[PDB]
């Protein structure tokens, strides 16, 4: 007997785990999906069952006179399914928050060439702002990990570039990402998603206005019972 | 089964002088050393005494013999590019310049060649030359 | 705890930053100089079926587009760096091209004519025939895209290790 | 053993010739596609092999007070691909330049019936402005001239509306412009594109901002080597 | 340096500048006048099949689209300037046409429902049933395109010369 489920940021139980990477570039183990006692087994199939992955990071600034523009954010600011205007996109490239004011902010203008942006409200001298743009460049892939804390193998190991997820309309059928390879969990065992990039992933930043999860990773999968 | 050897016989294969209804009179005549009958003589290609006044730079200019050739000799002033079987096809090229002239190729090595293509290699004044053949 | 087994004909796309590729900034009107230079990967083999898209993200230093009258050419080369005249796949302009969905909509996917199969040490080049007024090519700020493997659209590009006498016949690419 | 090439403004050589026509409406030549010795033959077949034409004329005016509108442009303007918005066109529709100031004038709005436009900038007195709009109506056809400077014939001499070359999404598959007839060049011979329509056409006018070439003729064709 | 010959079946599309149809500006309650008087070309015959698109680019003297409640019909006629009752291929409205994509995309193209053939002195007439409220019609700012000789989508028109047995069976309507 089989069904279809979704593995997600929170999944069927809170044995799932998530954590960040380093500032130097290295494959770090970002997010781990561990299997419960409720089920019997799990499967995931590339080219059949799709996967969505919205990464975003954090930077911040202090204010002063004339600071309407924000500099190159240490990443290449891609479009969003090839689109440019924030209103027109499946999700923002960029979000901002004035913490001194304790409010959300919106964007005036953008410059993908110099990887810079420009905002509505010039914040005050000594004002504090945090910003959440998309994650830039980097590579990502999967890993199996047994009950012993030990690796067992990777899955169609062609590490996928980061930008490709941002370059498509991930919801639209046909354009939905399908990775490759196959896998089969067991009971007490784990799978991991790993990443290398020049920037630090973030989740659960309390000051974020849109929701409790700036970034997500979700996947259609197949379950026994 | 011996008919295979019959068709494989070498009078019909690798005869140097290509036989097309060769009268024995003509065969005899080609080996005389007394006067120039119409088969006494060889055949080749040249252009002299004067060199060419080429002026092209881009589009390849052709030259054509009446043969298949087996060795070439060139005498040049300054600079050119040279090839066999260009350019529509993915053929190669050679560059030649002064200090390398007089150029020459073809041992009895096995060239089969009819056509030549020429181009004023850049990095010189209007400076073409002279092209010579032997079978 | 299985991961499963794979195939040979891996399906990909191609772009600038991969490590078998060379970008190179370009002046005004020197077509002979190669902008983009693919070489073979030293051991695998590449195959590009016909009817195959291109998404060239060509721009200037100052972020803007180039002249629409420009000619992009994709040409096959020898194993050294010379062109070949024959074996061209593409010669068209940029005014016909649109960047904001060039890899999304197949109806916007402008495509090839000929098939193509590349061996170990062979080279493919891109060339750019331009007027004299333009502002050139800033390859840091421009890029290229070619195929896609996650979708089911356009046509992904095939790569393989070696399968035997198919290789013996593929090696008949020699002139 | 053929391939698909483009013959364009400049293309495969510089034996190719561009030139104008006359103001007496008199069907003259425009462009000469002379074939070189590199190739062997060229094959054009309408109904199979696409074509494109951005024609664009010249006019000249003096600026003064109230000269925000450019007057009846003596050219049949259309909506580029049906849409009228300057920004959402696949390409612009008319651009003008104030020479004494040496400055582009990007446009606010357009009038499609009267064939007029209105801009952001009010240039000055004694000041020279020039406009290059897309040419509108007209009738053209292909001619074949031998190496002897003398005609053989034409290629389906049905005129085509000059405006059709703007009408569709020129690049999108299935929507490409074509024509009828077919033709086969030889080595040194020439095809010559011919035109008549109510005004001159221009190229290479230096003060044009967008490209060294104001207007172009392109044709996807088939080649023997 | 040959050009290559052709077939009699000249695959083309139609438009207004072709001087074998005359355009006529219309009032808002003149159903019977031909806006288009499509005379036979005096030297050729025309053929069309079911499944043929129409590009009714009917606009006013300010470029506004006319009333979608208008109806449009096209029909074969006699030689003296008079319809035939039979010989209809199209009867629908302007509201079923999206001008920015009426002649571009497939699903925004309406098509014929019958066969059709026209001789050298025959006439076809397009008729336009308007209510009075509209601003009539203008042709100078308007046009049409019947058939499509440019796309994989749609079809084209077959203009032909005299081809003996076929033309005999054709005139044997």
mmCIF file with all atom_site columns, N, CA and C in Angstrom, chain D residues 166-196:
data_model
loop_
_atom_site.group_PDB
_atom_site.id
_atom_site.type_symbol
_atom_site.label_atom_id
_atom_site.label_alt_id
_atom_site.label_comp_id
_atom_site.label_asym_id
_atom_site.label_entity_id
_atom_site.label_seq_id
_atom_site.pdbx_PDB_ins_code
_atom_site.Cartn_x
_atom_site.Cartn_y
_atom_site.Cartn_z
_atom_site.occupancy
_atom_site.B_iso_or_equiv
_atom_site.pdbx_formal_charge
_atom_site.auth_seq_id
_atom_site.auth_comp_id
_atom_site.auth_asym_id
_atom_site.auth_atom_id
_atom_site.pdbx_PDB_model_num
ATOM 1  N N  . UNK D 1 166 ? 6.143  44.588 -38.489 1.00 0.00 ? 166 UNK D N  1
ATOM 2  C CA . UNK D 1 166 ? 5.954  44.941 -37.096 1.00 0.00 ? 166 UNK D CA 1
ATOM 3  C C  . UNK D 1 166 ? 4.842  44.156 -36.417 1.00 0.00 ? 166 UNK D C  1
ATOM 4  N N  . UNK D 1 167 ? 4.043  43.393 -37.164 1.00 0.00 ? 167 UNK D N  1
ATOM 5  C CA . UNK D 1 167 ? 2.699  43.070 -36.691 1.00 0.00 ? 167 UNK D CA 1
ATOM 6  C C  . UNK D 1 167 ? 2.685  42.001 -35.605 1.00 0.00 ? 167 UNK D C  1
ATOM 7  N N  . UNK D 1 168 ? 3.532  40.997 -35.731 1.00 0.00 ? 168 UNK D N  1
ATOM 8  C CA . UNK D 1 168 ? 3.517  39.814 -34.880 1.00 0.00 ? 168 UNK D CA 1
ATOM 9  C C  . UNK D 1 168 ? 4.655  39.856 -33.871 1.00 0.00 ? 168 UNK D C  1
ATOM 10 N N  . UNK D 1 169 ? 4.693  38.927 -32.917 1.00 0.00 ? 169 UNK D N  1
ATOM 11 C CA . UNK D 1 169 ? 5.911  38.750 -32.125 1.00 0.00 ? 169 UNK D CA 1
ATOM 12 C C  . UNK D 1 169 ? 6.984  38.083 -32.956 1.00 0.00 ? 169 UNK D C  1
ATOM 13 N N  . UNK D 1 170 ? 7.771  38.919 -33.631 1.00 0.00 ? 170 UNK D N  1
ATOM 14 C CA . UNK D 1 170 ? 8.711  38.540 -34.684 1.00 0.00 ? 170 UNK D CA 1
ATOM 15 C C  . UNK D 1 170 ? 9.573  37.323 -34.374 1.00 0.00 ? 170 UNK D C  1
ATOM 16 N N  . UNK D 1 171 ? 9.883  37.114 -33.100 1.00 0.00 ? 171 UNK D N  1
ATOM 17 C CA . UNK D 1 171 ? 10.762 36.040 -32.668 1.00 0.00 ? 171 UNK D CA 1
ATOM 18 C C  . UNK D 1 171 ? 10.034 34.758 -32.316 1.00 0.00 ? 171 UNK D C  1
ATOM 19 N N  . UNK D 1 172 ? 8.816  34.866 -31.801 1.00 0.00 ? 172 UNK D N  1
ATOM 20 C CA . UNK D 1 172 ? 8.105  33.708 -31.291 1.00 0.00 ? 172 UNK D CA 1
ATOM 21 C C  . UNK D 1 172 ? 7.861  32.689 -32.393 1.00 0.00 ? 172 UNK D C  1
ATOM 22 N N  . UNK D 1 173 ? 7.904  31.419 -32.010 1.00 0.00 ? 173 UNK D N  1
ATOM 23 C CA . UNK D 1 173 ? 7.748  30.349 -32.979 1.00 0.00 ? 173 UNK D CA 1
ATOM 24 C C  . UNK D 1 173 ? 6.322  30.313 -33.501 1.00 0.00 ? 173 UNK D C  1
ATOM 25 N N  . UNK D 1 174 ? 6.197  30.141 -34.814 1.00 0.00 ? 174 UNK D N  1
ATOM 26 C CA . UNK D 1 174 ? 4.928  30.152 -35.483 1.00 0.00 ? 174 UNK D CA 1
ATOM 27 C C  . UNK D 1 174 ? 4.480  31.525 -35.928 1.00 0.00 ? 174 UNK D C  1
ATOM 28 N N  . UNK D 1 175 ? 4.988  32.574 -35.291 1.00 0.00 ? 175 UNK D N  1
ATOM 29 C CA . UNK D 1 175 ? 4.575  33.943 -35.539 1.00 0.00 ? 175 UNK D CA 1
ATOM 30 C C  . UNK D 1 175 ? 5.570  34.700 -36.411 1.00 0.00 ? 175 UNK D C  1
ATOM 31 N N  . UNK D 1 176 ? 6.591  34.020 -36.922 1.00 0.00 ? 176 UNK D N  1
ATOM 32 C CA . UNK D 1 176 ? 7.608  34.659 -37.740 1.00 0.00 ? 176 UNK D CA 1
ATOM 33 C C  . UNK D 1 176 ? 7.056  35.127 -39.081 1.00 0.00 ? 176 UNK D C  1
ATOM 34 N N  . UNK D 1 177 ? 7.478  36.324 -39.482 1.00 0.00 ? 177 UNK D N  1
ATOM 35 C CA . UNK D 1 177 ? 7.181  36.838 -40.810 1.00 0.00 ? 177 UNK D CA 1
ATOM 36 C C  . UNK D 1 177 ? 7.832  35.937 -41.849 1.00 0.00 ? 177 UNK D C  1
ATOM 37 N N  . UNK D 1 178 ? 7.160  35.766 -42.983 1.00 0.00 ? 178 UNK D N  1
ATOM 38 C CA . UNK D 1 178 ? 7.715  35.126 -44.162 1.00 0.00 ? 178 UNK D CA 1
ATOM 39 C C  . UNK D 1 178 ? 7.223  35.869 -45.395 1.00 0.00 ? 178 UNK D C  1
ATOM 40 N N  . UNK D 1 179 ? 7.518  35.303 -46.557 1.00 0.00 ? 179 UNK D N  1
ATOM 41 C CA . UNK D 1 179 ? 6.942  35.744 -47.816 1.00 0.00 ? 179 UNK D CA 1
ATOM 42 C C  . UNK D 1 179 ? 6.726  34.520 -48.686 1.00 0.00 ? 179 UNK D C  1
ATOM 43 N N  . UNK D 1 180 ? 6.479  34.734 -49.966 1.00 0.00 ? 180 UNK D N  1
ATOM 44 C CA . UNK D 1 180 ? 6.223  33.696 -50.937 1.00 0.00 ? 180 UNK D CA 1
ATOM 45 C C  . UNK D 1 180 ? 7.405  33.534 -51.873 1.00 0.00 ? 180 UNK D C  1
ATOM 46 N N  . UNK D 1 181 ? 7.224  32.663 -52.845 1.00 0.00 ? 181 UNK D N  1
ATOM 47 C CA . UNK D 1 181 ? 8.237  32.427 -53.832 1.00 0.00 ? 181 UNK D CA 1
ATOM 48 C C  . UNK D 1 181 ? 9.477  31.772 -53.273 1.00 0.00 ? 181 UNK D C  1
ATOM 49 N N  . UNK D 1 182 ? 10.415 31.566 -54.182 1.00 0.00 ? 182 UNK D N  1
ATOM 50 C CA . UNK D 1 182 ? 11.689 30.959 -53.858 1.00 0.00 ? 182 UNK D CA 1
ATOM 51 C C  . UNK D 1 182 ? 12.698 31.472 -54.863 1.00 0.00 ? 182 UNK D C  1
ATOM 52 N N  . UNK D 1 183 ? 13.976 31.255 -54.568 1.00 0.00 ? 183 UNK D N  1
ATOM 53 C CA . UNK D 1 183 ? 15.031 31.818 -55.389 1.00 0.00 ? 183 UNK D CA 1
ATOM 54 C C  . UNK D 1 183 ? 16.346 31.145 -55.051 1.00 0.00 ? 183 UNK D C  1
ATOM 55 N N  . UNK D 1 184 ? 17.256 31.160 -56.015 1.00 0.00 ? 184 UNK D N  1
ATOM 56 C CA . UNK D 1 184 ? 18.552 30.514 -55.904 1.00 0.00 ? 184 UNK D CA 1
ATOM 57 C C  . UNK D 1 184 ? 19.602 31.428 -56.516 1.00 0.00 ? 184 UNK D C  1
ATOM 58 N N  . UNK D 1 185 ? 20.463 31.971 -55.667 1.00 0.00 ? 185 UNK D N  1
ATOM 59 C CA . UNK D 1 185 ? 21.580 32.796 -56.086 1.00 0.00 ? 185 UNK D CA 1
ATOM 60 C C  . UNK D 1 185 ? 22.573 31.983 -56.919 1.00 0.00 ? 185 UNK D C  1
ATOM 61 N N  . UNK D 1 186 ? 23.604 32.667 -57.414 1.00 0.00 ? 186 UNK D N  1
ATOM 62 C CA . UNK D 1 186 ? 24.835 32.041 -57.877 1.00 0.00 ? 186 UNK D CA 1
ATOM 63 C C  . UNK D 1 186 ? 25.985 32.777 -57.194 1.00 0.00 ? 186 UNK D C  1
ATOM 64 N N  . UNK D 1 187 ? 27.219 32.542 -57.627 1.00 0.00 ? 187 UNK D N  1
ATOM 65 C CA . UNK D 1 187 ? 28.396 33.004 -56.913 1.00 0.00 ? 187 UNK D CA 1
ATOM 66 C C  . UNK D 1 187 ? 28.513 34.512 -56.794 1.00 0.00 ? 187 UNK D C  1
ATOM 67 N N  . UNK D 1 188 ? 28.746 35.221 -57.890 1.00 0.00 ? 188 UNK D N  1
ATOM 68 C CA . UNK D 1 188 ? 28.933 36.663 -57.838 1.00 0.00 ? 188 UNK D CA 1
ATOM 69 C C  . UNK D 1 188 ? 27.648 37.443 -58.004 1.00 0.00 ? 188 UNK D C  1
ATOM 70 N N  . UNK D 1 189 ? 26.540 36.783 -58.294 1.00 0.00 ? 189 UNK D N  1
ATOM 71 C CA . UNK D 1 189 ? 25.324 37.509 -58.597 1.00 0.00 ? 189 UNK D CA 1
ATOM 72 C C  . UNK D 1 189 ? 24.724 38.081 -57.327 1.00 0.00 ? 189 UNK D C  1
ATOM 73 N N  . UNK D 1 190 ? 23.624 38.791 -57.518 1.00 0.00 ? 190 UNK D N  1
ATOM 74 C CA . UNK D 1 190 ? 23.074 39.658 -56.506 1.00 0.00 ? 190 UNK D CA 1
ATOM 75 C C  . UNK D 1 190 ? 21.562 39.571 -56.488 1.00 0.00 ? 190 UNK D C  1
ATOM 76 N N  . UNK D 1 191 ? 21.026 39.635 -55.300 1.00 0.00 ? 191 UNK D N  1
ATOM 77 C CA . UNK D 1 191 ? 19.632 39.962 -55.083 1.00 0.00 ? 191 UNK D CA 1
ATOM 78 C C  . UNK D 1 191 ? 19.569 41.380 -54.582 1.00 0.00 ? 191 UNK D C  1
ATOM 79 N N  . UNK D 1 192 ? 18.488 42.054 -54.945 1.00 0.00 ? 192 UNK D N  1
ATOM 80 C CA . UNK D 1 192 ? 18.286 43.451 -54.643 1.00 0.00 ? 192 UNK D CA 1
ATOM 81 C C  . UNK D 1 192 ? 16.874 43.639 -54.132 1.00 0.00 ? 192 UNK D C  1
ATOM 82 N N  . UNK D 1 193 ? 16.771 44.129 -52.914 1.00 0.00 ? 193 UNK D N  1
ATOM 83 C CA . UNK D 1 193 ? 15.494 44.447 -52.309 1.00 0.00 ? 193 UNK D CA 1
ATOM 84 C C  . UNK D 1 193 ? 15.099 45.839 -52.746 1.00 0.00 ? 193 UNK D C  1
ATOM 85 N N  . UNK D 1 194 ? 13.861 45.952 -53.238 1.00 0.00 ? 194 UNK D N  1
ATOM 86 C CA . UNK D 1 194 ? 13.290 47.132 -53.849 1.00 0.00 ? 194 UNK D CA 1
ATOM 87 C C  . UNK D 1 194 ? 12.102 47.620 -53.044 1.00 0.00 ? 194 UNK D C  1
ATOM 88 N N  . UNK D 1 195 ? 11.825 48.915 -53.191 1.00 0.00 ? 195 UNK D N  1
ATOM 89 C CA . UNK D 1 195 ? 10.880 49.623 -52.346 1.00 0.00 ? 195 UNK D CA 1
ATOM 90 C C  . UNK D 1 195 ? 10.263 50.796 -53.083 1.00 0.00 ? 195 UNK D C  1
ATOM 91 N N  . UNK D 1 196 ? 9.017  51.072 -52.712 1.00 0.00 ? 196 UNK D N  1
ATOM 92 C CA . UNK D 1 196 ? 8.397  52.379 -52.904 1.00 0.00 ? 196 UNK D CA 1
ATOM 93 C C  . UNK D 1 196 ? 7.462  52.615 -51.728 1.00 0.00 ? 196 UNK D C  1
#
